Amino acid sequence: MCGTEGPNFYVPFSNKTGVVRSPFEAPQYYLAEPWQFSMLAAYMFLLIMLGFPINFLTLYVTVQHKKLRTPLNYILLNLAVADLFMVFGGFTTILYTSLHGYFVFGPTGCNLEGFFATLGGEIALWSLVVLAIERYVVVCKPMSNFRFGENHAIMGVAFTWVMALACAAPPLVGWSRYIPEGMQCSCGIDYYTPHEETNNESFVIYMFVVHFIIPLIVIFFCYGQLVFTVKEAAAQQQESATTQKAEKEVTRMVIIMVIAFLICWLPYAGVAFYIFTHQGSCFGPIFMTIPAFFAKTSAVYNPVIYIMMNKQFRNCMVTTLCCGKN
């Protein structure tokens, strides 16, 4: 018997020596050394110092440069807003709790932090799904006499917030729950404890199918097609060096986007899967931190990939940072 249970928590450490405490009430220095808690705090400090400016710039530069305010770009603004929910709801809270060594804000703060952080990563997740749908439509043109505009972009944004509420809301009201994870300083969905009163088993199956498998299939299909169309069109135009280079660029970027999506979400999905099919196994606190490390760090690498590497935004940002010149 692997940990210690409580009304709203599961500490991943045995209480045979009697030292375990509520992660809402006292430090967890028997799970991990104080310096490891400090390193958690350092890592959140890094993600704030990099994630805040990068995502805030994205919004600010868009306010200063008319060329960026196209409808295809609305979902990338949405991505930056989501990243900021993670920065201000998640990372700042965890910086604070890590340096106490436990979730000092108690079970209500655990629901708050877990909600805003989960909502953030989920809006981001679906933003990358919708962007792939939007680009597939625009390029592969699978419905004739259709022109992607403002209206559709608004719907895409609204859809991400609905899908994210469908993940983040139910654990506030009975289906799964928010409890402290890993080192017990951040809160997330209880995806690893069988907890029949809240129906954790069904919620994890729903999450895995609807919020991981569906996303992954939609992304592979949409970008799979997009690459096919672009490569077919370029083979029909080998006289153009331009078209050939654009085809190489599009293909490389699609590979990077798809790999980035897997890096971000496969660890949560794989760990959840392994735990679901190996219910007689202990999982320690550092191990349970790894999925979060991969997901949370996307609040930096997603805007680098989707925004910073796009040359329109990059010019405007330099201009904005250099007070109006270049």
Ligand X SMILES: *C/C=C(C)/C=C/C=C(C)/C=C/C1=C(C)CCCC1(C)C
Ligand Y SMILES: *[C@@H]1O[C@H](CO)[C@@H](O[C@@H]2O[C@H](CO)[C@@H](O[C@@H]3O[C@H](CO[C@@H]4O[C@H](CO)[C@@H](O)[C@H](O)[C@@H]4O)[C@@H](O)[C@H](O[C@H]4O[C@H](CO)[C@@H](O)[C@H](O)[C@@H]4O)[C@@H]3O)[C@H](O)[C@H]2NC(C)=O)[C@H](O)[C@H]1NC(C)=O
Which residue, 46 or 209, has its beta carbon nearer to ligand PLM? 46
Cβ count within 10 A of residue 317: 20
User: In this structure, are residues 117 and 86 in contact, taking their beta carbons and an 8 Å threshold?
Assistant: yes
Which residue, 221 or 274, has its beta carbon nearer to ligand BOG? 221
| Minimum CB–partner distance for residue 181 and ligand Y (Å) | 16
Of ligand Y, ligand PLM, ligand BOG, none, which one does residue 156 interact with (CB within 5 to 8 Å by kind)?
A: none
| Minimum CB–partner distance for residue 28 and ligand Y (Å) | 11
Say which amino acid occupies 255.
I
The rounded distance, in Å, linking the Cα atoms of 265 and 43 is: 19
- Mask: binding to ligand BOG, 23-52, rule CB under 6 A, as x and -? ----x-------------------------
The rounded distance, in Å, linking the Cα atoms of 326 and 168 is: 43
Of ligand BOG, ligand X, ligand Y, none, which one does residue 6 interact with (CB within 5 to 8 Å by kind)?
A: ligand Y
User: In this structure, are residues 62 and 75 in contact, taking their beta carbons and an 8 Å threshold?
Assistant: no
User: In this structure, are residues 280 and 274 in contact, taking their beta carbons and an 8 Å threshold?
Assistant: no
User: In this structure, are residues 79 and 127 in contact, taking their beta carbons and an 8 Å threshold?
Assistant: yes
List the interface residues with ligand Y, window 7-66 (CB under 6 A).
15, 18, 20-22
Which residue, 1 or 322, has its beta carbon nearer to ligand PLM? 322
Maximum pairwise Cα distance, the chain: 76
From candidates 193, 229, 251, 312, binder to ligand BOG by CB under 6 A: 251
Angle in degrees, CA 269, 157, 129, rounded to 5? 35
The rounded distance, in Å, linking the Cα atoms of 191 and 34 is: 27
Which residue, 251 or 297, has its beta carbon nearer to ligand BOG? 251
- Mask: binding to ligand X, 36-75, rule CB under 6 A, as x and -? ----------------------------------------
Size of the site for ligand X (CB under 6 A): 24
Nearest to 99 by CA among 36, 8, 31, 10: 36
| Minimum CB–partner distance for residue 264 and ligand BOG (Å) | 16
Interface with ligand BOG (CB under 6 A): 27, 95-96, 99-101, 220, 223-224, 227, 248, 251, 254-255, 258
